[PDB]
Amino acid sequence: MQIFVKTLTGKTITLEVEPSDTIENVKAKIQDKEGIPPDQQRLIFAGKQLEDGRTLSDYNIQKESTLHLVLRLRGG
Amino acid sequence: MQIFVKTLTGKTITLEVEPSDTIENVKAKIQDKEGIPPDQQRLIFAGKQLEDGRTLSDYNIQKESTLHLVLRLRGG
Amino acid sequence: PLAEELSCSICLEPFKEPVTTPCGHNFCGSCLNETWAVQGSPYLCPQCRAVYQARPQLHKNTVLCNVVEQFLQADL
Amino acid sequence: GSHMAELCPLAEELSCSICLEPFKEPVTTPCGHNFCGSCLNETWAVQGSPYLCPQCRAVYQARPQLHKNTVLCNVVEQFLQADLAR
Amino acid sequence: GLPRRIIKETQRLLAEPVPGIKAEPDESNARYFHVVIAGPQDSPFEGGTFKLELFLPEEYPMAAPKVRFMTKIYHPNVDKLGRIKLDILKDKWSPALQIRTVLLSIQALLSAPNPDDPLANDVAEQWKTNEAQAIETARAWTRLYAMNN
Amino acid sequence: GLPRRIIKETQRLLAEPVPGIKAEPDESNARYFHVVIAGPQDSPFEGGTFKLELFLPEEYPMAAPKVRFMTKIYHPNVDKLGRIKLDILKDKWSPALQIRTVLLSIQALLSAPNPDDPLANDVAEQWKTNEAQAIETARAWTRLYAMNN
Ligand SMILES: [Zn+2]
Ligand SMILES: [Zn+2]
Ligand SMILES: [Zn+2]
Ligand SMILES: [Zn+2]
């Protein structure tokens, strides 16, 4: 299956994934595509900040879902 | 008028010039297109190394003449 | 589309005299100048938060310039 | 191989001046020049400090750490990979 | 005489709406944005619809938008006046960030409170020492304030 | 098993010959190049046709080609063995340079001798202390060695 990632500029990249892929994996593909290291990436879906250890299917992220890329944020 | 400059890789760029342009002006145009500063540029035409102060017409360089780019060289 | 690859993440227009940071990210010279003129050390890449303890001097990416120039001249 | 017609005029801009092939994982020097990561690695592994830009002889007193230029990667990837619909 | 980025961004905002987030400019002001963000799934704010004010200062995009909750919310990183203590809104802002990604960031902040560094000290304290109660309170305030308007 | 660059370069050389310069590979060796350079106009070598050997070592383009005059020439920067003291052939080489640009550079060197840093000290001295004589000598040698060869 495929998914989409909306990058900072609004530009949308498409990613080849399996549902068993971790968010880390996705981040690595994004790093390959966008040159942003994973520790600086945050992926938002349904308003959740997705967690590195969980998988795409753990979040019910299915084909042609869009994940929104964001930079590391810290509430203080 | 137009002239051609064969860059290091072999790709040929075209330049809008006047016969009254100095080799320096040309170098500046090459620098604009290729990012090689004039002090590093050397232009060969009819086997001569063209001089910064002289103009295109001093060398009888006419439209669609080709100049060959080379790097700063020093015989020792 | 590469129309988007070739657009600056700061001004959202096609790169103008783009410059490439050591972290491999591109900005209009002016946009990045403005960004890092605004602040003092440390200087961060807008795109990946790569940290520069001083402002790196950069010249324009002539290939990318020319590619955009081709893109745009072709469009017209 | 074939390429999308409108992308064909980019072939020379998008080729490495060291290996003369389309950039592979290109890297951009601070002086604004692009090389396949490997080609530049080889070039500057050959010598020791100072390291000079192959294109403009800009002098670096140490090996600059450089990451791949993703925009140029993706552009090159389009130039190569873009096909018509089948 | 709007800077072209704000025009483009606004256009893209209208054309490419993100689910769970509404942002539209004020007809009397292109720099003032009326925002509504949905509370994130599986959060105490779930089912909530929170109104925010987003404002683009003159130095934008070199400086962050000014963003303020206008709906009351129980969150250690948001005070009684709705002010948001989030790093991307001050020192760790980036001109590559945008309205969209700022709002998404705030939504993520709702999804992931940080009591260890407080803005609302009472709330944050409550959140550390008594997380369950703080969560239930957050859900309650979400019901009372963010299921109308 | 020729590197693709050298193949390409050779093709371009054949297709895009530069005026005043001939370069062809040896049928028995793709890395051995038989070169002929025209003496630059308005140089003491004008009217000359100088044979050179250009050779691509295994490390090319990371290392410079080996280039040697095979025609005898009176030049401060070329010795009796034809060896050429030119910086781009050693310390100031760059892998972006090519056969074409090296040959052009040698032609340029002919058009612009440098006696102050000698390879042939006798010639360079003569070039310094008595330039007219050195030029006349160079022209004489061009006639004797580099015409009808
Ligand atoms: Zn820009
Ligand atoms: Zn960066
Ligand atoms: Zn290469
Ligand atoms: Zn350079």
Coordinates of C-alpha atoms and ligand atoms in Angstrom, one line a residue:
Chain A
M1 CA 0.0 0.0 0.0
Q2 CA 0.8 3.7 -0.4
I3 CA 0.5 6.6 1.9
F4 CA 1.0 10.4 1.6
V5 CA 3.1 12.8 3.7
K6 CA 2.4 16.5 3.6
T7 CA 5.8 18.3 4.0
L8 CA 6.4 21.7 5.6
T9 CA 5.9 23.6 2.4
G10 CA 2.6 21.9 1.6
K11 CA 4.2 19.7 -0.9
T12 CA 2.9 16.1 -0.7
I13 CA 5.3 13.1 -1.1
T14 CA 4.0 9.6 -1.5
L15 CA 5.5 6.6 0.4
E16 CA 5.6 2.9 -0.3
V17 CA 4.8 1.2 3.0
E18 CA 3.5 -2.0 4.6
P19 CA 0.9 -1.7 7.4
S20 CA 3.5 -3.4 9.7
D21 CA 5.9 -0.5 9.2
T22 CA 6.9 1.5 12.3
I23 CA 6.7 5.3 12.4
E24 CA 10.5 5.2 12.6
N25 CA 10.5 3.5 9.2
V26 CA 8.3 6.2 7.8
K27 CA 10.6 8.8 9.2
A28 CA 13.6 7.2 7.6
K29 CA 11.8 7.3 4.2
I30 CA 11.0 10.9 4.8
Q31 CA 14.7 11.6 5.7
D32 CA 15.7 9.9 2.5
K33 CA 13.2 12.1 0.6
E34 CA 13.6 15.4 2.6
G35 CA 16.9 15.4 4.4
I36 CA 15.3 16.0 7.7
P37 CA 16.6 13.7 10.5
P38 CA 13.9 11.6 12.3
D39 CA 14.5 13.2 15.7
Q40 CA 13.4 16.5 14.2
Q41 CA 10.4 15.0 12.5
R42 CA 7.0 14.8 14.0
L43 CA 4.1 13.2 12.1
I44 CA 0.5 14.2 12.9
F45 CA -2.5 12.2 12.0
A46 CA -6.0 12.8 13.3
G47 CA -4.4 15.4 15.6
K48 CA -2.3 12.8 17.3
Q49 CA 1.5 13.0 17.4
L50 CA 2.4 9.5 16.2
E51 CA 4.9 7.5 18.3
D52 CA 8.1 6.0 16.8
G53 CA 7.6 2.5 18.3
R54 CA 4.0 2.0 17.1
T55 CA 3.2 0.8 13.6
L56 CA 1.0 2.3 10.8
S57 CA -1.7 -0.3 11.5
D58 CA -1.6 0.4 15.3
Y59 CA -3.0 3.8 14.3
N60 CA -5.4 2.5 11.7
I61 CA -3.4 4.4 9.0
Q62 CA -4.6 2.9 5.7
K63 CA -3.9 3.4 2.0
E64 CA -3.9 7.0 0.8
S65 CA -4.0 8.3 4.3
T66 CA -2.2 11.6 4.7
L67 CA 0.3 12.2 7.5
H68 CA 1.3 15.8 8.2
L69 CA 4.9 16.6 8.9
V70 CA 5.8 19.0 11.6
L71 CA 9.0 20.0 13.4
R72 CA 9.9 19.0 17.0
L73 CA 7.7 20.9 19.3
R74 CA 7.8 21.3 23.1
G75 CA 5.1 22.8 25.3
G76 CA 6.4 24.6 28.3
Chain B
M1 CA 25.2 39.6 -30.7
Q2 CA 25.6 36.2 -29.2
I3 CA 28.7 34.1 -28.4
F4 CA 29.3 30.6 -27.1
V5 CA 31.4 29.4 -24.2
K6 CA 32.3 25.8 -23.8
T7 CA 32.4 25.1 -20.1
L8 CA 34.6 22.6 -18.3
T9 CA 32.3 19.6 -18.7
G10 CA 31.8 20.3 -22.4
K11 CA 28.3 21.8 -22.1
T12 CA 28.1 25.0 -24.1
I13 CA 26.4 28.2 -22.7
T14 CA 25.3 31.1 -24.8
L15 CA 26.1 34.7 -23.9
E16 CA 24.6 38.1 -25.0
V17 CA 27.6 40.4 -25.5
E18 CA 28.8 43.5 -27.5
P19 CA 32.0 43.6 -29.5
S20 CA 33.1 46.3 -27.1
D21 CA 32.8 44.0 -24.1
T22 CA 36.0 43.2 -22.3
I23 CA 37.1 39.7 -21.5
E24 CA 36.4 40.7 -17.9
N25 CA 32.7 41.4 -18.7
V26 CA 32.5 38.1 -20.4
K27 CA 34.1 36.4 -17.3
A28 CA 31.5 38.1 -15.1
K29 CA 28.7 36.7 -17.3
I30 CA 30.3 33.2 -17.1
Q31 CA 30.6 33.7 -13.4
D32 CA 26.9 34.6 -13.2
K33 CA 26.0 31.4 -15.1
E34 CA 28.7 29.0 -13.7
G35 CA 29.8 30.4 -10.3
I36 CA 33.5 30.3 -11.2
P37 CA 35.2 33.6 -10.2
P38 CA 37.0 35.6 -13.0
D39 CA 40.4 35.1 -11.4
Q40 CA 39.9 31.4 -11.9
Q41 CA 38.6 31.6 -15.4
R42 CA 40.8 31.5 -18.5
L43 CA 39.3 31.8 -21.9
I44 CA 41.0 30.2 -25.0
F45 CA 40.1 31.3 -28.5
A46 CA 42.2 30.4 -31.6
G47 CA 44.8 29.0 -29.2
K48 CA 45.4 32.3 -27.5
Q49 CA 44.7 33.0 -23.8
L50 CA 42.5 36.1 -24.0
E51 CA 43.5 39.1 -21.8
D52 CA 41.2 40.7 -19.4
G53 CA 41.7 44.2 -20.6
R54 CA 41.3 43.5 -24.3
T55 CA 37.8 43.4 -25.9
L56 CA 36.0 40.9 -28.2
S57 CA 36.7 43.0 -31.3
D58 CA 40.4 43.3 -30.5
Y59 CA 40.4 39.5 -31.1
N60 CA 38.0 39.5 -34.0
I61 CA 35.5 37.4 -32.1
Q62 CA 32.3 37.6 -34.0
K63 CA 28.8 36.3 -33.5
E64 CA 28.5 32.6 -32.7
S65 CA 32.2 32.3 -32.1
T66 CA 33.1 29.7 -29.4
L67 CA 35.3 30.4 -26.5
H68 CA 36.8 27.6 -24.4
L69 CA 36.8 27.8 -20.6
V70 CA 39.9 26.6 -18.7
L71 CA 41.1 27.0 -15.2
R72 CA 44.0 29.2 -14.0
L73 CA 47.2 27.6 -15.2
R74 CA 50.9 28.3 -14.4
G75 CA 53.9 27.0 -16.3
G76 CA 56.8 26.3 -14.0
Chain C
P1 CA 5.5 17.9 -9.5
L2 CA 9.0 19.5 -9.3
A3 CA 7.3 22.9 -9.6
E4 CA 7.1 22.4 -5.8
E5 CA 10.6 21.0 -5.4
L6 CA 11.8 24.2 -7.0
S7 CA 9.9 26.5 -4.6
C8 CA 11.5 28.2 -1.6
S9 CA 10.1 27.1 1.8
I10 CA 10.4 30.7 3.1
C11 CA 8.9 32.8 0.3
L12 CA 6.9 29.9 -1.4
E13 CA 8.0 31.2 -4.8
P14 CA 10.4 29.5 -7.3
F15 CA 13.9 29.8 -6.0
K16 CA 15.6 33.0 -6.8
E17 CA 19.4 32.7 -6.9
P18 CA 19.1 29.8 -4.5
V19 CA 21.8 28.9 -2.1
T20 CA 22.4 25.4 -0.6
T21 CA 23.3 24.9 3.1
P22 CA 25.8 22.2 4.2
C23 CA 22.7 20.2 5.5
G24 CA 21.6 20.0 1.9
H25 CA 18.7 22.5 1.9
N26 CA 18.0 25.2 -0.5
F27 CA 16.8 28.8 -0.1
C28 CA 16.6 32.0 -2.1
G29 CA 19.8 33.8 -1.1
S30 CA 17.7 36.7 0.1
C31 CA 15.3 34.6 2.1
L32 CA 18.1 32.8 4.0
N33 CA 20.0 36.1 4.4
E34 CA 16.9 37.6 5.9
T35 CA 16.3 34.6 8.2
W36 CA 19.8 34.5 9.6
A37 CA 20.3 38.3 9.6
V38 CA 17.3 38.5 11.8
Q39 CA 19.1 36.5 14.5
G40 CA 22.6 36.1 16.0
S41 CA 24.4 32.8 16.7
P42 CA 23.4 30.0 16.7
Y43 CA 22.0 29.9 13.2
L44 CA 19.5 27.1 12.4
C45 CA 18.4 25.6 9.1
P46 CA 14.8 26.5 8.7
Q47 CA 14.1 23.0 7.3
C48 CA 16.0 20.6 9.7
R49 CA 17.2 22.7 12.7
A50 CA 20.8 21.9 11.8
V51 CA 22.9 24.1 14.1
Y52 CA 25.6 26.4 12.8
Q53 CA 27.6 28.0 15.6
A54 CA 28.5 30.7 13.0
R55 CA 26.9 31.8 9.7
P56 CA 28.3 29.7 6.8
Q57 CA 29.2 31.8 3.7
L58 CA 27.3 30.4 0.7
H59 CA 27.2 31.1 -3.0
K60 CA 24.3 30.4 -5.3
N61 CA 23.7 26.9 -6.6
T62 CA 24.2 27.6 -10.3
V63 CA 22.8 24.2 -11.5
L64 CA 19.6 24.8 -9.5
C65 CA 19.5 28.4 -10.7
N66 CA 19.8 27.3 -14.3
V67 CA 17.2 24.5 -13.9
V68 CA 14.7 27.0 -12.4
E69 CA 15.7 29.4 -15.2
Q70 CA 15.0 26.7 -17.8
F71 CA 11.7 25.8 -16.1
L72 CA 10.6 29.4 -16.1
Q73 CA 11.9 30.4 -19.6
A74 CA 10.2 27.3 -21.0
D75 CA 6.9 28.2 -19.2
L76 CA 7.0 31.6 -21.0
Chain D
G1 CA 17.1 5.2 -21.9
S2 CA 14.2 7.4 -22.7
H3 CA 13.1 10.5 -20.7
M4 CA 10.2 12.8 -20.6
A5 CA 10.7 15.2 -23.5
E6 CA 10.4 18.5 -21.6
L7 CA 12.9 17.2 -19.1
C8 CA 15.4 16.3 -21.8
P9 CA 17.1 19.8 -21.9
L10 CA 18.2 19.4 -18.3
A11 CA 20.5 16.5 -19.1
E12 CA 23.7 18.5 -19.0
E13 CA 23.0 20.7 -16.0
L14 CA 22.1 17.5 -14.1
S15 CA 25.3 15.6 -14.9
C16 CA 28.3 15.4 -12.5
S17 CA 31.5 17.1 -13.8
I18 CA 33.6 14.3 -12.4
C19 CA 31.9 11.2 -13.6
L20 CA 29.8 12.9 -16.4
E21 CA 26.7 10.9 -15.4
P22 CA 23.5 12.2 -13.8
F23 CA 24.1 13.2 -10.2
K24 CA 23.9 10.3 -7.8
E25 CA 23.0 11.4 -4.3
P26 CA 24.5 14.9 -5.1
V27 CA 26.1 17.2 -2.5
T28 CA 26.5 20.9 -2.8
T29 CA 29.6 22.8 -1.7
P30 CA 29.3 26.1 0.0
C31 CA 30.7 27.7 -3.2
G32 CA 27.5 26.4 -4.9
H33 CA 28.8 23.4 -6.9
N34 CA 27.3 20.0 -7.1
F35 CA 28.9 16.6 -7.2
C36 CA 27.8 13.0 -6.6
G37 CA 28.6 12.3 -3.0
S38 CA 30.8 9.5 -4.0
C39 CA 32.7 11.4 -6.7
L40 CA 33.5 14.2 -4.3
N41 CA 34.3 11.8 -1.5
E42 CA 36.8 10.1 -3.8
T43 CA 38.2 13.5 -5.0
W44 CA 38.8 14.7 -1.4
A45 CA 39.8 11.3 0.0
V46 CA 42.6 11.3 -2.6
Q47 CA 44.2 14.4 -1.1
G48 CA 44.6 16.0 2.4
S49 CA 43.9 19.5 3.6
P50 CA 43.4 21.9 1.9
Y51 CA 40.5 20.6 -0.1
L52 CA 39.6 22.4 -3.3
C53 CA 36.3 22.6 -5.2
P54 CA 36.9 20.8 -8.5
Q55 CA 34.9 23.5 -10.3
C56 CA 36.2 26.8 -8.8
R57 CA 39.2 25.9 -6.6
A58 CA 37.5 27.4 -3.6
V59 CA 39.7 26.4 -0.6
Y60 CA 38.5 24.5 2.5
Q61 CA 41.0 24.2 5.3
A62 CA 39.1 21.0 6.3
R63 CA 36.7 18.6 4.8
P64 CA 33.3 20.2 5.0
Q65 CA 30.6 17.9 6.2
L66 CA 27.9 18.0 3.5
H67 CA 24.5 16.3 3.3
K68 CA 22.8 15.3 0.0
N69 CA 20.9 18.1 -1.8
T70 CA 17.4 16.6 -1.7
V71 CA 15.8 19.1 -4.1
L72 CA 18.5 18.2 -6.7
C73 CA 18.2 14.5 -5.9
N74 CA 14.4 14.6 -6.5
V75 CA 14.8 16.7 -9.7
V76 CA 17.3 14.2 -11.0
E77 CA 15.0 11.4 -9.9
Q78 CA 12.3 13.0 -12.0
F79 CA 14.5 13.5 -15.0
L80 CA 15.4 9.8 -14.8
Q81 CA 12.2 8.1 -13.5
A82 CA 9.4 10.1 -15.0
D83 CA 7.6 8.1 -17.7
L84 CA 4.5 8.4 -19.8
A85 CA 1.4 6.4 -18.7
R86 CA 1.1 2.8 -19.9
Chain E
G1 CA -0.5 45.2 -0.4
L2 CA -0.1 41.8 1.3
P3 CA 3.2 40.0 1.2
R4 CA 2.9 37.3 -1.4
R5 CA 3.6 34.5 1.0
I6 CA 0.5 35.3 3.1
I7 CA -1.7 35.5 0.0
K8 CA -0.4 32.1 -1.2
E9 CA -0.6 30.5 2.2
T10 CA -4.2 31.8 2.6
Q11 CA -5.1 30.5 -0.8
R12 CA -3.6 27.1 -0.1
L13 CA -5.4 27.1 3.3
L14 CA -8.8 27.6 1.6
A15 CA -8.0 25.3 -1.3
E16 CA -6.4 22.5 0.8
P17 CA -8.3 22.4 4.1
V18 CA -6.8 20.0 6.7
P19 CA -9.4 17.9 8.6
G20 CA -9.9 18.8 12.3
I21 CA -8.7 22.3 11.6
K22 CA -10.6 25.4 10.4
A23 CA -8.7 28.6 9.6
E24 CA -10.1 31.6 7.7
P25 CA -9.1 35.2 7.6
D26 CA -11.2 38.0 8.9
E27 CA -12.9 39.9 6.0
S28 CA -11.8 43.1 7.7
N29 CA -8.2 41.8 8.2
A30 CA -6.1 39.5 6.1
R31 CA -3.6 39.0 9.0
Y32 CA -6.3 38.0 11.6
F33 CA -7.4 34.4 11.4
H34 CA -10.4 32.8 13.1
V35 CA -9.4 29.3 13.9
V36 CA -11.2 26.2 15.2
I37 CA -9.2 23.1 16.1
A38 CA -10.7 19.7 17.0
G39 CA -9.4 18.1 20.2
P40 CA -7.2 15.1 19.1
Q41 CA -8.5 11.6 19.1
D42 CA -8.1 9.6 22.3
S43 CA -7.3 12.8 24.2
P44 CA -9.4 14.3 27.1
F45 CA -10.2 17.0 24.6
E46 CA -11.7 14.6 22.1
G47 CA -15.0 15.8 20.7
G48 CA -14.1 19.3 21.5
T49 CA -14.1 22.2 19.1
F50 CA -11.7 24.9 20.3
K51 CA -11.7 28.5 19.0
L52 CA -8.3 30.2 18.5
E53 CA -7.1 33.5 17.4
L54 CA -4.1 33.4 15.0
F55 CA -2.5 36.7 14.0
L56 CA 0.3 37.3 11.6
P57 CA 2.7 40.1 12.8
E58 CA 4.4 42.4 10.3
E59 CA 7.7 40.4 10.7
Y60 CA 6.0 37.2 9.6
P61 CA 7.3 34.7 8.4
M62 CA 10.6 35.7 10.0
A63 CA 8.7 35.6 13.3
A64 CA 6.0 33.3 14.5
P65 CA 2.3 34.1 14.4
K66 CA 0.6 35.2 17.6
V67 CA -1.7 32.4 18.6
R68 CA -4.1 32.4 21.5
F69 CA -6.9 30.1 22.7
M70 CA -10.2 31.9 22.8
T71 CA -12.0 28.9 24.2
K72 CA -11.3 28.0 27.8
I73 CA -9.2 24.9 28.1
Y74 CA -7.6 22.8 31.0
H75 CA -4.0 22.3 29.9
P76 CA -0.7 22.7 31.8
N77 CA 0.8 24.5 28.8
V78 CA -2.1 27.0 28.4
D79 CA -3.1 29.6 31.0
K80 CA -6.5 31.0 32.1
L81 CA -6.2 33.7 29.4
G82 CA -5.6 31.1 26.6
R83 CA -1.9 32.0 26.1
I84 CA 0.1 29.1 24.7
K85 CA 3.6 28.3 25.9
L86 CA 5.0 26.4 23.0
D87 CA 8.6 26.7 21.8
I88 CA 7.8 27.0 18.1
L89 CA 5.9 30.1 18.9
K90 CA 9.0 31.8 20.2
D91 CA 12.8 30.9 20.1
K92 CA 12.5 27.6 18.1
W93 CA 10.2 29.1 15.4
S94 CA 11.2 28.6 11.8
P95 CA 10.3 30.5 8.7
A96 CA 9.5 27.2 7.0
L97 CA 6.7 26.6 9.4
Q98 CA 3.3 27.9 8.4
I99 CA -0.2 28.5 9.8
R100 CA -1.2 24.9 9.0
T101 CA 1.8 23.3 10.7
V102 CA 1.5 25.7 13.7
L103 CA -2.2 24.8 14.2
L104 CA -1.3 21.1 13.8
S105 CA 1.5 21.6 16.3
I106 CA -1.0 23.1 18.8
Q107 CA -3.3 20.2 18.2
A108 CA -0.4 17.9 18.9
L109 CA 0.3 19.8 22.1
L110 CA -3.3 19.1 23.1
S111 CA -2.6 15.5 22.3
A112 CA 0.6 15.6 24.4
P113 CA 0.6 17.9 27.5
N114 CA 3.9 18.6 29.4
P115 CA 3.3 19.3 33.1
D116 CA 7.0 19.1 34.0
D117 CA 7.5 22.6 32.5
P118 CA 4.4 24.5 33.5
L119 CA 2.6 27.7 32.3
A120 CA -0.4 27.0 34.5
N121 CA 1.4 25.9 37.6
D122 CA -1.8 24.7 39.5
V123 CA -3.0 22.8 36.4
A124 CA 0.4 21.3 35.7
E125 CA 0.9 20.3 39.4
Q126 CA -2.6 18.7 39.3
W127 CA -1.5 16.9 36.1
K128 CA 1.7 15.5 37.7
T129 CA 0.4 14.7 41.2
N130 CA -3.1 13.6 40.0
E131 CA -3.1 12.8 36.3
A132 CA -6.5 11.0 36.3
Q133 CA -8.3 13.9 37.9
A134 CA -6.6 16.4 35.6
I135 CA -7.7 14.3 32.6
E136 CA -11.3 14.1 33.9
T137 CA -11.3 17.8 34.5
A138 CA -9.9 18.4 31.0
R139 CA -12.7 16.3 29.6
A140 CA -15.3 18.1 31.7
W141 CA -14.1 21.6 30.6
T142 CA -14.1 20.3 27.0
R143 CA -17.7 19.3 27.4
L144 CA -18.7 22.6 29.2
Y145 CA -16.8 25.0 26.9
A146 CA -16.0 23.3 23.6
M147 CA -19.2 21.6 22.5
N148 CA -21.0 24.8 21.4
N149 CA -20.0 27.9 19.4
Chain F
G1 CA 36.4 -2.4 -19.1
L2 CA 36.9 1.3 -19.8
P3 CA 35.5 3.8 -17.3
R4 CA 32.4 5.4 -18.9
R5 CA 33.9 8.9 -18.6
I6 CA 36.9 8.1 -20.8
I7 CA 34.6 6.5 -23.4
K8 CA 32.4 9.6 -23.4
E9 CA 35.3 12.0 -23.5
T10 CA 36.8 10.1 -26.5
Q11 CA 33.4 10.1 -28.3
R12 CA 33.1 13.9 -27.7
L13 CA 36.6 14.4 -28.9
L14 CA 35.9 12.6 -32.1
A15 CA 32.6 14.4 -32.6
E16 CA 33.6 17.8 -31.3
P17 CA 37.1 18.4 -32.5
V18 CA 38.6 21.7 -31.3
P19 CA 40.3 23.8 -34.0
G20 CA 44.1 23.7 -33.6
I21 CA 44.1 20.4 -31.7
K22 CA 44.0 16.8 -32.9
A23 CA 43.7 13.9 -30.4
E24 CA 42.9 10.3 -31.2
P25 CA 43.2 7.1 -29.2
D26 CA 45.7 4.3 -30.1
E27 CA 43.9 1.5 -31.9
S28 CA 46.0 -0.7 -29.5
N29 CA 45.2 1.5 -26.5
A30 CA 42.2 3.6 -25.5
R31 CA 44.2 5.3 -22.8
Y32 CA 47.1 6.3 -25.1
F33 CA 46.3 9.4 -27.1
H34 CA 48.3 10.7 -30.1
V35 CA 48.1 14.5 -30.0
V36 CA 48.9 17.3 -32.4
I37 CA 48.8 20.9 -31.3
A38 CA 49.1 24.0 -33.5
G39 CA 51.4 26.7 -32.4
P40 CA 49.3 29.6 -31.2
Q41 CA 48.9 32.5 -33.5
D42 CA 51.2 35.5 -32.8
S43 CA 53.5 33.1 -30.8
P44 CA 57.0 32.2 -31.7
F45 CA 55.5 28.7 -32.4
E46 CA 53.1 30.0 -35.1
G47 CA 52.9 27.6 -38.0
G48 CA 54.2 24.7 -36.0
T49 CA 52.6 21.3 -35.6
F50 CA 53.7 19.7 -32.3
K51 CA 53.2 16.1 -31.6
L52 CA 52.3 15.2 -28.0
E53 CA 51.6 12.0 -26.1
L54 CA 48.7 12.1 -23.7
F55 CA 48.2 9.1 -21.4
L56 CA 45.3 8.3 -19.0
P57 CA 46.6 6.6 -15.8
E58 CA 44.3 4.1 -14.0
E59 CA 43.4 6.7 -11.4
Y60 CA 42.0 9.2 -14.0
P61 CA 40.2 11.5 -13.5
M62 CA 41.3 11.6 -9.8
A63 CA 44.8 12.1 -11.1
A64 CA 46.0 14.1 -14.1
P65 CA 46.8 12.7 -17.6
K66 CA 50.5 12.2 -18.3
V67 CA 51.3 14.6 -21.1
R68 CA 54.6 14.9 -22.9
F69 CA 55.8 16.8 -26.0
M70 CA 57.1 14.4 -28.7
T71 CA 58.2 17.2 -30.9
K72 CA 61.3 19.1 -29.8
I73 CA 60.4 22.7 -28.7
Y74 CA 62.2 25.7 -27.3
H75 CA 60.2 26.7 -24.3
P76 CA 61.2 27.7 -20.7
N77 CA 58.6 25.3 -19.3
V78 CA 59.5 22.2 -21.4
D79 CA 62.8 20.3 -21.2
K80 CA 64.9 18.4 -23.8
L81 CA 62.7 15.3 -23.0
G82 CA 59.5 17.2 -23.8
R83 CA 58.4 16.9 -20.2
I84 CA 56.0 19.8 -19.3
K85 CA 56.1 21.7 -16.0
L86 CA 52.5 22.9 -15.7
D87 CA 50.6 23.1 -12.4
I88 CA 47.3 21.6 -13.7
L89 CA 49.3 18.4 -14.5
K90 CA 50.4 18.0 -10.9
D91 CA 49.4 20.0 -7.8
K92 CA 46.6 22.2 -9.3
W93 CA 44.9 19.3 -11.2
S94 CA 41.1 19.1 -10.8
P95 CA 38.9 16.1 -11.7
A96 CA 36.6 18.5 -13.6
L97 CA 39.3 19.2 -16.1
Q98 CA 39.4 17.0 -19.2
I99 CA 41.6 15.9 -22.1
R100 CA 40.2 18.9 -24.1
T101 CA 40.9 21.5 -21.5
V102 CA 44.3 20.1 -20.7
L103 CA 45.3 20.3 -24.3
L104 CA 43.9 23.8 -24.6
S105 CA 45.9 24.6 -21.4
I106 CA 49.1 23.4 -23.0
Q107 CA 48.3 25.5 -26.1
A108 CA 47.8 28.4 -23.8
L109 CA 51.1 27.7 -22.1
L110 CA 52.8 28.0 -25.5
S111 CA 51.0 31.2 -26.1
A112 CA 52.4 32.4 -22.7
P113 CA 55.8 31.1 -21.5
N114 CA 57.0 31.6 -17.9
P115 CA 60.8 31.9 -17.4
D116 CA 60.8 33.1 -13.8
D117 CA 60.0 29.5 -12.5
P118 CA 62.1 27.4 -14.9
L119 CA 61.9 23.8 -15.9
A120 CA 64.7 24.2 -18.5
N121 CA 66.9 26.8 -16.7
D122 CA 69.1 27.5 -19.7
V123 CA 66.1 28.3 -21.9
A124 CA 64.4 30.3 -19.2
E125 CA 67.5 32.3 -18.5
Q126 CA 67.9 33.0 -22.2
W127 CA 64.2 34.0 -22.2
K128 CA 64.8 36.4 -19.3
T129 CA 68.1 38.0 -20.3
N130 CA 67.5 38.1 -24.0
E131 CA 63.8 37.7 -24.9
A132 CA 64.2 38.6 -28.6
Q133 CA 66.9 35.9 -29.0
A134 CA 64.8 33.3 -27.3
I135 CA 61.8 34.1 -29.4
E136 CA 63.9 33.9 -32.6
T137 CA 65.4 30.7 -31.4
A138 CA 61.9 29.3 -30.7
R139 CA 60.7 30.3 -34.2
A140 CA 63.8 28.7 -35.6
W141 CA 63.2 25.4 -33.7
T142 CA 59.5 25.5 -34.8
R143 CA 60.7 25.6 -38.4
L144 CA 63.3 22.9 -37.9
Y145 CA 61.3 20.5 -35.8
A146 CA 57.6 21.3 -36.0
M147 CA 57.1 21.9 -39.7
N148 CA 56.5 19.0 -42.2
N149 CA 56.8 16.5 -39.3
Ligands
ZN1 ZN 12.6 32.4 -1.2
ZN2 ZN 19.0 21.8 6.8
ZN3 ZN 29.6 11.9 -10.3
ZN4 ZN 33.1 25.5 -6.2

